[PDB]
């Protein structure tokens, strides 16, 4: 939680390569928010940055299945917290799986969690679909010999509760 020559702010002070003009004081950003500063006692260009922030997210199978949950810390690096680092943030309490299955509980950036294997919440790169490669050749055609008749329910709102 820093104060520089009366400038106050709270951030992560780092070394930085951005180069001031000599007379200048604050670097800034598109938002006018303080970005870079110059250490007065020895002139050096320090960045600034937000704290980890993000939202907490509780990934759970239904409380009917388990009382176990895997916490996702969103958009952070895993320090400030069985841990795993994701694209979407710091995930805790779900064992990574190199296998890839259907997306079940959507998390972020393709990471999708499911409960099954004893058992533990897992996290894995969602397989979009099962894979197929059509067997294709310029004389090859496949004509269905038989059919099914399927009845697929489709459901739509029409009106909503009227009020005054």
């Amino acid at each position: 939680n820093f104060n520089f020559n009366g400038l106050t702010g709270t951030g992560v002070l780092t070394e930085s390569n951005k180069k001031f003009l000599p007379f200048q004081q604050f670097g800034r950003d598109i938002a006018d928010t303080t970005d870079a500063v110059r250490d007065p006692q020895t002139l050096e260009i320090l960045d600034i940055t937000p704290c980890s922030f993000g939202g907490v997210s509780v990934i759970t199978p239904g409380t009917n299945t388990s009382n176990q949950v895997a916490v996702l810390y969103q958009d952070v690096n895993c320090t400030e917290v069985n841990v795993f680092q994701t694209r979407a943030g710091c995930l805790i309490g779900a064992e990574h799986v190199n296998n890839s299955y259907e997306c079940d509980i959507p998390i972020g950036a393709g990471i999708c969690a499911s409960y099954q294997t004893s058992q533990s919440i897992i996290a894995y790169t969602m397989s979009l679909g099962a894979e197929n490669s059509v067997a294709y050749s310029n004389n090859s055609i496949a004509i269905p010999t038989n059919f099914t008749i399927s009845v697929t329910t489709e459901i739509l709102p029409v009106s909503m509760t009227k009020t005054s």
């Binding site: 939680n1 820093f2 002070l13 704290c51 907490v56 759970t60």
Partner: protein, 48 residues
């Protein structure tokens, strides 16, 4: 971090799927007051 989800859901049975519950703000370890290098009051010029 699990029980907070039940409060957010407002149901003793939290059905499957992900729930945003709370937020964490990393608190800062200590304060930096960095006034520039070097005044001084002339007590060497008054007292000596």
């Amino acid at each position: 971090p699990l029980s907070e989800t039940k409060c957010t859901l407002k149901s003793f049975t939290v059905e499957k799927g992900i729930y945003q519950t709370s937020n964490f703000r990393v608190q800062p370890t200590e304060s930096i007051v960095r006034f520039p290098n070097i005044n001084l009051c002339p007590f060497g010029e008054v007292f000596n």
